[PDB]
Amino acid sequence: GLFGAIAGFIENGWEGMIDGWYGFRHQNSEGTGQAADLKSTQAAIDQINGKLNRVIEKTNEKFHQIEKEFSEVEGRIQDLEKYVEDTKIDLWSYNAELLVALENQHTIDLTDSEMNKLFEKTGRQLRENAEDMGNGCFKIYHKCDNACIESIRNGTYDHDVYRDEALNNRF
Amino acid sequence: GLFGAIAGFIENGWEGMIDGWYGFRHQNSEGTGQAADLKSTQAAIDQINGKLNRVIEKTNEKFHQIEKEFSEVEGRIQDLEKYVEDTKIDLWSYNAELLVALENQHTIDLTDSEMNKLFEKTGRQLRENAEDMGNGCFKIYHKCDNACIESIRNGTYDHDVYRDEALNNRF
Amino acid sequence: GLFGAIAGFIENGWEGMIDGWYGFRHQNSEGTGQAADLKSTQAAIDQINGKLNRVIEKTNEKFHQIEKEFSEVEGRIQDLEKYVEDTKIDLWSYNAELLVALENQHTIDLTDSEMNKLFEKTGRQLRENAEDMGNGCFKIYHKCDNACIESIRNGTYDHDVYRDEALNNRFQ
Amino acid sequence: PGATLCLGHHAVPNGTLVKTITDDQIEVTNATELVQSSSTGKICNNPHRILDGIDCTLIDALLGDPHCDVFQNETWDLFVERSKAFSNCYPYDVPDYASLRSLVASSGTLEFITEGFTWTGVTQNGGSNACKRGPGSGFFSRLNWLTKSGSTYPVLNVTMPNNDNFDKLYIWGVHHPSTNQEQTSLYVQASGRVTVSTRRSQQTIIPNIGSRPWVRGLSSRISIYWTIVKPGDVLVINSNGNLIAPRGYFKMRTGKSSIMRSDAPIDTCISECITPNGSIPNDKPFQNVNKITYGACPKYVKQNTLKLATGMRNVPE
Amino acid sequence: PGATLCLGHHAVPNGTLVKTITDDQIEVTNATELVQSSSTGKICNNPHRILDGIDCTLIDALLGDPHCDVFQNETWDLFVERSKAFSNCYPYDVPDYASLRSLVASSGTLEFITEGFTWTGVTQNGGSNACKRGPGSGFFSRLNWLTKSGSTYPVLNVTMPNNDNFDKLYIWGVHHPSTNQEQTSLYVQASGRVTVSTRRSQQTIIPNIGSRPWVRGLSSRISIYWTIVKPGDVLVINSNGNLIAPRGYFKMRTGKSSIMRSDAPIDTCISECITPNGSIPNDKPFQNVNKITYGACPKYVKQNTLKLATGMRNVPEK
Amino acid sequence: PGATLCLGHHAVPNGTLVKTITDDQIEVTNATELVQSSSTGKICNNPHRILDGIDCTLIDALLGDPHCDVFQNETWDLFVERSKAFSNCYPYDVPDYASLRSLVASSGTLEFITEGFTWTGVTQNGGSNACKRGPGSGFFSRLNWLTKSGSTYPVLNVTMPNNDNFDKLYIWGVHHPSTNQEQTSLYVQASGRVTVSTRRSQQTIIPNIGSRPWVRGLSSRISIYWTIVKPGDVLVINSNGNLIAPRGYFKMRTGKSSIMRSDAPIDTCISECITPNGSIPNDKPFQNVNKITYGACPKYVKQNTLKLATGMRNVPEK
Ligand SMILES: *[C@@H]1O[C@H](CO)[C@@H](O[C@@H]2O[C@H](CO)[C@@H](O[C@@H]3O[C@H](CO[C@H]4O[C@H](CO)[C@@H](O)[C@H](O)[C@@H]4O)[C@@H](O)[C@H](O[C@H]4O[C@H](CO)[C@@H](O)[C@H](O)[C@@H]4O)[C@@H]3O)[C@H](O)[C@H]2NC(C)=O)[C@H](O)[C@H]1NC(C)=O
Ligand SMILES: *[C@@H]1O[C@H](CO)[C@@H](O[C@@H]2O[C@H](CO)[C@@H](O[C@@H]3O[C@H](CO[C@H]4O[C@H](CO)[C@@H](O)[C@H](O)[C@@H]4O)[C@@H](O)[C@H](O)[C@@H]3O)[C@H](O)[C@H]2NC(C)=O)[C@H](O)[C@H]1NC(C)=O
Ligand SMILES: *[C@@H]1O[C@H](CO)[C@@H](O[C@@H]2O[C@H](CO)[C@@H](O[C@@H]3O[C@H](CO)[C@@H](O)[C@H](O)[C@@H]3O)[C@H](O)[C@H]2NC(C)=O)[C@H](O)[C@H]1NC(C)=O
Ligand SMILES: *[C@@H]1O[C@H](CO)[C@@H](O[C@@H]2O[C@H](CO)[C@@H](O)[C@H](O)[C@H]2NC(C)=O)[C@H](O)[C@H]1NC(C)=O
Ligand SMILES: *[C@@H]1O[C@H](CO)[C@@H](O[C@@H]2O[C@H](CO)[C@@H](O)[C@H](O)[C@H]2NC(C)=O)[C@H](O)[C@H]1NC(C)=O
Ligand SMILES: *[C@@H]1O[C@H](CO)[C@@H](O[C@@H]2O[C@H](CO)[C@@H](O)[C@H](O)[C@H]2NC(C)=O)[C@H](O)[C@H]1NC(C)=O
Ligand SMILES: *[C@@H]1O[C@H](CO)[C@@H](O[C@@H]2O[C@H](CO)[C@@H](O)[C@H](O)[C@H]2NC(C)=O)[C@H](O)[C@H]1NC(C)=O
Ligand SMILES: *[C@@H]1O[C@H](CO)[C@@H](O[C@@H]2O[C@H](CO)[C@@H](O)[C@H](O)[C@H]2NC(C)=O)[C@H](O)[C@H]1NC(C)=O
Ligand SMILES: *[C@@H]1O[C@H](CO)[C@@H](O[C@@H]2O[C@H](CO)[C@@H](O)[C@H](O)[C@H]2NC(C)=O)[C@H](O)[C@H]1NC(C)=O
Ligand SMILES: *[C@@H]1O[C@H](CO)[C@@H](O)[C@H](O)[C@H]1NC(C)=O
Ligand SMILES: *[C@@H]1O[C@H](CO)[C@@H](O)[C@H](O)[C@H]1NC(C)=O
Ligand SMILES: *[C@@H]1O[C@H](CO)[C@@H](O)[C@H](O)[C@H]1NC(C)=O
Ligand SMILES: *[C@@H]1O[C@H](CO)[C@@H](O)[C@H](O)[C@H]1NC(C)=O
């Protein structure tokens, strides 16, 4: 993808993360855990539902048209009827092929983008208390029990509380 | 948007920024101030004017065509004339709908991208003298008067001049 | 481009990089050098070949159609034949124009992206042993000989080996 | 002394392959089909008014072939013509058959109003054993076969004004005998003529005497013509032989009606979109069931499947 | 002892809603309309040459219905036919009327050249009270109603070569009497015929006899036909009755000319694009005014508005 | 004591200009052309079966104009009509010529099967010095010009059932004499008639006597008609004069055949796509050579060039 997170610096997906599209796994002295990130999950889902609803909106309604199958050979007028329909079908077929190609490229990029945005947001919370290990993980340089982890996941982590401990450990 | 800056880590736009599209606000020892960034603003404007000029370039010119309204019932030939026109209109209506959807998605992403590029460029100038506070602001760890702020805004800031002071304050 | 690397923080391309699309130049105690990055180069090439092969795939096969040139004035039926064809040509010409505009915008952005991804990946390997100079170059704060440079280029650099040396140089 | 916090995304063991700008096949966690490719095989009778022609074509119902008179005054959104249909009256043809079928189909009704045409000096209501109605010889219900009375067939000259506020469709014909004995025996004149006109249009048809192939015992034919009379205009019919006269007009409507050839059964169920293969759902934007459709239908495309990704790239390893 | 430096972007109290791939409505700071949906309601008389048909259809100006005599030799880029137009000459029809109207409209001129046809043994210039020119009887200016002279109508057999370097359009007709008495009284033969040919083409018409509804006093009709003769080809006309003869030819041109039905008034002003509703600007790529257009026009679409974003997402509040 | 590691990308001294969403021209390192704009100027004779009409149109080959009889029973994927083609037999017209030409071109064969029609009481095999076959007078090979025998021409009434499982195409005609003397010398009756029908179709043509322009000595004409007879149906031909009879039927086929007008020479070479200008390669998705094509062809567009970027932005200098 354009952002290089999914199928990129994140080595692979998690089949065990069932209640969200994106999320956090941790290991600390209390064990390991996992939780979905609701906001990123919902941002991707909303964009994809938005896209989907634009596409499957309102088929056209047509009534009397032209004939499209013929039981007798007739020449010029039938040649034109068949050519008009064949032309129409080829143009719509092209439209359908192009539409899904563009949409799908964009769905893969926007989902990659949401992974990357969650990664960036987490890093910004952690300030000088953690380092990016390069694989979508942060090494956190202070004791970080379950409540502390949850404070990162819920956006209330106060980096200043831990900064002295963390800097001593990093440097 | 894809880059996560506009309507993202930058919480909202500034109605008070009336002379530019993107820019800087600061607080230092001489007070607070705001300035537009001309290059980022002009890059966004130039790309938008470029795409607009492509879209509004050259209408086709047509002269004698087919009839499109009819005063008497005729059957097969008229059914065909009407079908041809209705088919054409539906195809052009689709092209128009898709063109503005793709264009508009791209305008939102390219404007988000310009905001993010300006942010990254600023961080890169500041080197080890500042930290990303996570909301589009940098905390600068040294006295940075008005001339110093302007040196950042104009791309001439010399991080080495302040590094000792900054590192002492950060760590 | 959207990522701001090519024609951005990377100020220009290298005409002297003649064996890859993306790569590295270094200076260390053993001199200077250049090397193509094969993975980034191939990722861009593979995406471009992918989109080219989708575009040049499968022309349509058509046989008996309608007449498109006429030697006599005839009025209504000929008017319609010519309008159907003119309409078709204008629609395909529009599809062709739009297709190359969209593809080309995207090729520029995907190549910019591949540059940016390589830069970010390199940064991540270096951890606290280097700083981004802001022009696509890293200042590495330890002695880093040819084999060390190659360890970065091949993705096996061990930041812990050099961390004490680098931090001493960066911060003290 | 510390902790690790990893960011990640979900995956599934087996995702779905889709196409993009750069890849003919790439796996995502989920996708949805945009091409409708199946039908139940049955045409739903709601919400459109469907009229099953059964053994009858629309033109045979129009003319009033006796086995089709069940359809007199019927209406439809969609008239469905079956492959088993057959004609069982006087052998006929219709120059520009396709146009007459189309304009009646689009009108959406066979509502017919009889008018008091006076035919002085001729015998009315001729019939044939090629067109039995009950046990006896008969003829199209909507047409009136005129022949001589006594030893003469005078010049017929009749008019019917349109004093209504809608357009009238008149269906009429011309009889082509197979021999001169037949021509003179029916119409006295050795050669006939039929002229039907309005203030703005006219048709004169000269009958042609000769053998066509035996159909239902007959080498003779009737040719069918039509004339539309607008409000304030007038119909005049003038003939000295071979006229197959109208008995009145069909009321012409405009609206959403049409016609379709199909052998699919009709079922009681609901579907906006009708194809000859049966009704199809219209939740998807495209369909590959049939280029022939009626109603609110997905657009026909050549592809039998097109998958729209609705999830991220699937990277279970 | 430090500073803060924040990056940001502008916003406005209320922007404009646009559509994207993912959103049916999202607010941006600015947008521009791509559908032209209005017209002044008047057709501008420049830069295209507009010819107002007034009370005349193009076919009646072609044939030369007397009240359309003012259109003789006229030219146009766009002929405008009005709903008030009426015919006031011999009642007629044109099999394939639409094709004759189209090819004349496309040729863009009624330039007519009289030719010295000789019609030996018949009376020329027949007229009718259905087709008055002043208080007296008349006929289409470009057609010549031939009838018997003395007690006979001989077979007419005439040719007119095209030795020019452009195509000639010949308009002619066939008279359909209402009775046999009329037929014989005018043409002597009990059944006429008209055959008009070129080297590789022919039309043969047999008149139709019978009563039809009175139009301006008459139960009779004329049917109009047309024949194009290319350089080096020739016209031959052969008839033993019922011929409505040509008087000459219309010069055929190719170019940008056309015809439109409209009741919009013509105004002194300039616009490349014309619809029946009136002229419209063509700065936008699309329009929803009318599927019928002439000139350099935006493309007709069904949408009445389509907004192209020309600024960023408008985010005045969190 | 340290090192510097710079990331970068390649560039070239001059790349190629392409179009994007935002730029009419921007330089990339490489691009490829998507519009085929050239042809060799020759039509390749493989893989499609090409039949060069040389001096003959498809209709003249169909009817059996003697100089076109070389084409008897020929087949083609693409029939190529040349501007130098000429007719050299009895002068004729075909109402709806374009449709007969189309349906024969599409059938892709002139395979003809003679049938044993019986024409009792008329003389067969009429010919003309307008249509020489070798040194003597002759006629179209597929048609049979019937005239009186002795002093009479009876009512012809013949039938030919289709008991095959393919459709039969019958080509037949009607003679229009230039004078009554010719009409009666040939056909006895003063006015003829031809009626040809199947179980659900019929066509009656009344000849029209009179002069057309002199062509190869003749001011008379033949008009050509056609009738298709399906399996289980039957043909009836009924005439009391002026019938130009069929000798049998053309076998109808369905498939990929067509016809094209071109003066391009035909070369020994291989190309799937044929235009009147010559064959063209079909590796590109679009072409601007000709809107007329046959085979697996790029789509015709108006642009003469469209470049697809195949490299990044070319930024050799700041
Ligand atoms: C109804 O009206 C039409 C139109 O007027 C008449 O048609 C004309 O008929 C005449 C007589 O048949 C035709 O005359 C013939 O013209 C031929 C073509 O001439 C061209 O080529 C020659 C030689 O190269 C040139 O000299 C000439 O200028 C032309 O370029 C000639 O080849 C014929 O000549 C041969 O036959 C004639 C007559 O038998 C002899 O005089 C000659 O010596 C020679 O043997 C011949 O002159 C004329 O072409 C017709 N015109 C058209 C437009 O069709 C009908 O005849 C008339 N019908 C009736 C029943 O009256
Ligand atoms: C002009 O020529 C025409 C063709 O030859 C003549 O038409 C023929 O006329 C005869 C006499 O009426 C018809 O004969 C009748 O045929 C029917 C139907 O026969 C078919 O079906 C039956 C039953 O299934 C079957 O038994 C036969 O084998 C046939 O398959 C018979 O039922 C009658 O008894 C009767 O014999 C011909 O059908 C008809 N042929 C065609 C092709 O139309 C016509 O008579 C001639 N006209 C003149 C003036 O002489
Ligand atoms: C065949 O029938 C038609 C229609 O019925 C007859 O047409 C009618 O002919 C009469 C007698 O000329 C016309 O009368 C005229 O009416 C006008 C009023 O508009 C009046 O001003 C005149 O003084 C005259 O009386 C009548 O309009 C006309 N009707 C129609 C519908 O055309 C025709 O006469 C019949 N033909 C024969 C040969 O009998
Ligand atoms: C964010 O996470 C923290 C850590 O779990 C939450 O604060 C704790 O809440 C638990 C359970 O309610 C209490 O036992 C602790 O006393 C709290 N600790 C602190 C540091 O306050 C906090 O509620 C969460 N905030 C939000 C917005 O959900
Ligand atoms: C894969 O994506 C599709 C489309 O978003 C999902 O189908 C929708 O699911 C909801 C909830 O069941 C339904 O109410 C909608 O009607 C469905 N929409 C369509 C277009 O079918 C589907 O659930 C997703 N599959 C998985 C495994 O998540
Ligand atoms: C066939 O339908 C027609 C058209 O609706 C019927 O004609 C109408 O009948 C009703 C009831 O008698 C009248 O109120 C209308 O005024 C009639 N319309 C016209 C224009 O005359 C006709 O009665 C129907 N025939 C039958 C046998 O039901
Ligand atoms: C819907 O009916 C159409 C028309 O009968 C079917 O298309 C035909 O399918 C058969 C078998 O594949 C082919 O031999 C014919 O050539 C097809 N005709 C055309 C015009 O395509 C079609 O398969 C049916 N589809 C469904 C879903 O029932
Ligand atoms: C341009 O003129 C057209 C044709 O009259 C107008 O379209 C018609 O508008 C009326 C009233 O809205 C409708 O009832 C008709 O059905 C329309 N006819 C057609 C053919 O669409 C149209 O509104 C005019 N446009 C403008 C902007 O003046
Ligand atoms: C292929 O042949 C076509 C048709 O002859 C050429 O198109 C003509 O080109 C000339 C010169 O440019 C124009 O004046 C004509 O108007 C064109 N005719 C039509 C019908 O478009 C065309 O140039 C040829 N293309 C190539 C590559 O040889
Ligand atoms: C940048 O900023 C400083 C003021 O802090 C000023 O002295 C210098 O001239 C500026 N350079 C430019 C290019 O404006
Ligand atoms: C990477 O480079 C180092 C240093 O030269 C070398 O020891 C090692 O073989 C390389 N590894 C790979 C995977 O090529
Ligand atoms: C809005 O966009 C258009 C197109 O660029 C521009 O002409 C107009 O002046 C803009 N208005 C503002 C407020 O910038
Ligand atoms: C029409 O133009 C022609 C050719 O220029 C000319 O001979 C003729 O007299 C003109 N007629 C009128 C009414 O001016």
Ligand SMILES: *[C@@H]1O[C@H](CO)[C@@H](O)[C@H](O)[C@H]1NC(C)=O
């Ligand atoms: C390459 O050539 C063109 C002229 O054909 C020139 O305008 C363009 O700037 C050149 N590109 C570079 C990178 O110098």
Ligand SMILES: *[C@@H]1O[C@H](CO)[C@@H](O)[C@H](O)[C@H]1NC(C)=O
């Ligand atoms: C330019 O791109 C095309 C298409 O992939 C390729 O065939 C050609 O060799 C390329 N040229 C260069 C300079 O790489």
Ligand SMILES: *[C@@H]1O[C@H](CO)[C@@H](O)[C@H](O)[C@H]1NC(C)=O
């Ligand atoms: C012409 O083709 C037909 C149909 O294949 C064949 O049966 C017939 O014998 C052929 N005639 C000749 C002379 O080869």
